[PDB]
Design an enzyme around this catalytic site. Structure first.
Site, short mmCIF file in Angstrom:
data_model
loop_
_atom_site.label_atom_id
_atom_site.label_comp_id
_atom_site.label_asym_id
_atom_site.label_seq_id
_atom_site.Cartn_x
_atom_site.Cartn_y
_atom_site.Cartn_z
N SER A 1 -4.88 5.79 10.16
CA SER A 1 -3.53 6.17 9.81
C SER A 1 -3.59 7.31 8.81
O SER A 1 -2.99 8.37 9.02
CB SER A 1 -2.79 4.98 9.21
OG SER A 1 -2.68 3.93 10.16
N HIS B 1 0.83 -1.19 0.00
CA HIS B 1 0.00 0.00 0.00
C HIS B 1 0.87 1.25 0.00
O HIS B 1 2.05 1.20 0.34
CB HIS B 1 -0.91 0.00 1.24
CG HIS B 1 -0.20 0.34 2.51
ND1 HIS B 1 0.96 -0.29 2.91
CD2 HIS B 1 -0.43 1.30 3.43
CE1 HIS B 1 1.41 0.27 4.01
NE2 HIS B 1 0.58 1.24 4.35
N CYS C 1 4.42 5.86 4.99
CA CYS C 1 4.50 4.68 5.82
C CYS C 1 5.89 4.10 5.73
O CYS C 1 6.54 4.18 4.70
CB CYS C 1 3.50 3.63 5.37
SG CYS C 1 3.76 2.06 6.20
N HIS D 1 -5.28 5.18 2.15
CA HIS D 1 -4.45 4.14 1.53
C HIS D 1 -4.76 3.81 0.08
O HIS D 1 -5.76 4.24 -0.48
CB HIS D 1 -4.57 2.84 2.32
CG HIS D 1 -4.11 2.94 3.74
ND1 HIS D 1 -4.50 3.96 4.58
CD2 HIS D 1 -3.34 2.12 4.49
CE1 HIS D 1 -3.98 3.77 5.78
NE2 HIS D 1 -3.28 2.65 5.75
N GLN E 1 -6.14 -2.78 10.57
CA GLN E 1 -7.34 -2.01 10.84
C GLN E 1 -8.41 -2.44 9.83
O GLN E 1 -8.23 -2.28 8.61
CB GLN E 1 -7.10 -0.52 10.66
CG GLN E 1 -6.01 0.06 11.50
CD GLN E 1 -5.73 1.49 11.11
OE1 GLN E 1 -6.61 2.35 11.17
NE2 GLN E 1 -4.49 1.75 10.69
#
Length: 153
Positions: A144, A49, A103, A147, A121
């Site tokens: 976060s 991702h 990330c 994505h 998640q």
């Protein structure tokens, strides 16, 4: 017909008959599947991702900018752009996640290695086990950030 989360419709202010997926947010003209039932899902899959964070993100901080100042709206208009280049072919997923993914996985083409239905998640997880090997998703929101998941296995 259509696999899990696959619906059809037509986008706003323009009559386009296409296929949407409310779990993935993947949109395409071609039809998703072509008689096999009872299938379901494997019990462990591998993804990748490109996560782009905003202000209301859990940890509004990443290796690219010590303090994230961009907003959801901005961070979203941003993921779209990357989606634009991925699908057009201007750049490839890896190359992008590598250069911009907020990330830690950037230093790995965006890989996260295979995981089971418990470590991620739900929003990500559900979109990973709904993608078929090879298929990518649209924007996916988790605490976060936004994505772009690419199923590799």
């Amino acid at each position: 017909k259509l696999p899990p989360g696959w619906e059809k419709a037509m986008s706003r202010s323009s009559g386009r008959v296409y296929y949407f997926n409310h779990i993935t947010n993947a949109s395409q003209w071609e039809r998703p599947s072509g008689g096999k039932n009872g299938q379901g899902e494997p019990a462990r899959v591998r993804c990748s991702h490109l996560l782009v964070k905003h202000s209301q993100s859990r940890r509004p901080s990443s290796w690219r900018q010590e303090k994230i100042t961009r907003t959801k709206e901005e961070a979203l208009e941003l993921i779209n752009g990357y989606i634009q280049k991925i699908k057009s072919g201007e750049e490839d997923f890896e190359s992008l996640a590598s250069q911009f993914s907020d990330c830690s996985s950037a230093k790995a083409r965006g890989d996260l290695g295979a995981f089971s239905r418990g470590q991620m998640q739900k929003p990500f997880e559900d979109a990973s086990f709904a993608l078929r090997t090879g298929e990518m998703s649209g924007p996916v929101f988790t605490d976060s950030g936004i994505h772009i998941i690419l199923r590799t296995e």
